[PDB]
């Protein structure tokens, strides 16, 4: 072999296998992607520019842009490194990976594609699939449907129909960031809480200073006299 | 000894300054202190050239908690000694005591010149060695 194709631009994708072996010879070492062509790979692919991606080997373990080997290995992984998932803030496990350098031992790999070729494929090149979700910060949306910085979005905000069958309802986002006559109010409540505090300490500081000094001043008729 | 550098490494009581540019009279400093706890801070301390950090008075070791003695037993260590404390203990059964003793490892400064036999008060430092804890503070000769 299956292959695991992913034409981005539209977003699609598909699964065409090759099961011939002499039209297969290729990919067989160019590590992860080092562009594999698509004339000796399959002639539904022709001038197609098939980046190698990565994907699964057999018995069937992950492949890793890192391993430097067509071998089968079993290093220590980390919350960070992928091949892996950490089941604990601060924890590490041993597993296996047949490395990024291809060879026959594969059920699957990925073809993601750069410059599509002359020849037409069906259910990637054909079919699309949405733009699935949608952005957020308006300032991403001026990046998206502009908004005329000033006129403000609210307006062309992205949303969705959605069906009770008989009473469709309009589920919608929540921005975050949005400068209000709330938000500002808090820059706000802060500054005058900065100043507020300050005219307090300055004042004590001195009121102590002169109170300490209605004494040290009297320290002096506090000798000769009482 | 007595000659002060001797310990390749040079010596000084840390944070002390003297001022080869500026009129110098007295040339040297010192830093000293006064233990405390009813003591007397002798004069071979504010006089004595020597260095030793582990000095009570000429250096950076505090004295807190025991105050105790006794009878010196051996001195053979380059600035450190040993004490006995022959004590008594009351077995509840034969209703009578025994002469028991523990020995004690302690630092010591050149300010005191102790032979064996002498009665001797001591303090109790942070820790100062592997064993080692107390610092002599007052000798009690013949």
């Amino acid at each position: 072999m299956k292959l695991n194709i992913s034409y981005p631009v539209n977003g699609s994708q598909k699964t065409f296998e090759i099961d011939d072996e002499h039209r297969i010879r290729v990919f067989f070492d160019a590590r992860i992607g080092q562009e594999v062509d698509g004339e000796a790979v399959g002639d539904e692919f022709k001038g197609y520019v098939f980046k190698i991606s990565g994907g699964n080997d057999k018995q069937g373990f992950p492949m890793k842009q890192g391993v430097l080997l067509p071998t089968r290995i079993a290093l220590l992984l980390t919350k960070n490194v992928s091949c892996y998932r950490p089941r604990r803030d601060g924890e590490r496990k041993r597993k296996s990976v047949r490395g990024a350098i291809v060879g026959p031992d594969l059920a699957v790999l990925a073809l993601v594609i750069v410059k599509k070729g002359e020849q037409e494929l069906e259910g990637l090149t054909d079919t699309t699939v949405p733009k699935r979700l949608g952005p957020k910060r308006a300032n991403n949306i001026r990046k998206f449907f502009g908004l005329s910085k000033e006129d403000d979005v609210r307006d062309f905000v992205i949303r969705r129909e959605v069906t009770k069958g008989e009473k469709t309802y309009t589920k919608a986002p929540k921005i975050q960031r949005l400068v209000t006559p709330q938000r500002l109010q808090r820059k706000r409540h802060q500054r005058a809480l900065k100043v507020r505090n300050a005219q307090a300490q300055r004042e004590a500081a001195a009121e102590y200073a002169q109170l300490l000094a209605k004494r040290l001043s009297e320290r002096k008729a506090e000798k000769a006299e009482i | 000894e007595l000659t002060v550098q001797s310990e390749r490494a040079f010596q000084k009581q840390p944070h002390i300054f003297n001022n080869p540019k500026v009129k110098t009279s007295k040339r040297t400093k010192r830093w000293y202190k006064n233990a405390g706890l009813g003591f007397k801070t002798p004069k071979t301390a504010i006089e004595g050239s020597y260095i030793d950090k582990k000095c009570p008075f000429t250096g950076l070791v505090s004295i807190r908690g025991k105050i105790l003695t006794g009878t010196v037993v051996s001195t053979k260590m380059h600035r450190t000694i040993v004490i006995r404390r022959a004590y008594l203990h009351y077995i509840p059964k034969y209703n009578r005591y025994e002469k028991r003793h523990k020995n004690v490892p302690v630092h010591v400064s050149p300010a005191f010149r102790v032979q064996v036999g002498d009665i001797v008060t001591v303090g109790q430092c942070r820790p100062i060695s592997k064993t080692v804890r107390f610092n002599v503070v007052k000798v009690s000769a013949a």
Binding site: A204, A205, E207, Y208, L211, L212, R215 | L37, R64, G65
Partner: protein
Amino acid sequence: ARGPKKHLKRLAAPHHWLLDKLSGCYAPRPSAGPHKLRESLPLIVFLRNRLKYALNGREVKAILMQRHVKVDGKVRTDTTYPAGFMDVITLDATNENFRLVYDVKGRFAVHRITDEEASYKLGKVKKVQLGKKGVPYVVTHDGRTIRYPDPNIKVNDTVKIDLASGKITDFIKFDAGKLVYVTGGRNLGRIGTIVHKERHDGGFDLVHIKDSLDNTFVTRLNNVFVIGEQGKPYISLPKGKGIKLSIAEERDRRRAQQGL
């Protein structure tokens, strides 16, 4: 055993908390108090095993939640708030006002006060430092942190604050003839004199006192808390003034008082 303990085996709770001995495997304990752990309390005790105002402990979460009891004029909705000697605990339902302070016997006590008097408290002074930007400050057994204060104030007295504010109204001194409540030690739960500190100096300072019946005595400097000049004792004091009785006397007053 590795970090610090987070539980408290009942038995191990202090014996004046007076806690049962059965049913509750576990007592509490208090978390990170402005108080000291042992000579203190939680409201989870003071609000079922003492007063009544709870039945369960679930019930005692439910009175607090409601933000309906203020310690030192401030809410708390801990459940094991580490309250102590000197405190305010105000009842919002109820103007009902308890100053924590020991029995005579030995206790804690249940002492009502004078919605006026919740007002202030008797800040102990526990140390003194020019601290941080070069500013002096006293830090109060209440585990509480007080700034720009006068220099006349020294090491070992109180200072009336205002709860509403952390002011430092009036301070008292430590001198051969002032009243003294004894905080902790056989004599906790008594007043009240300073006959004579007995300096020394590692450390151990010692004190002499007497009382209203002329009995006397000698305890640690540590465990002393001035309150006023003989008279005006800056409170109130619970019954029996806080007095001590050769049980030869106590038995009597329960024989005097046989009435039902």
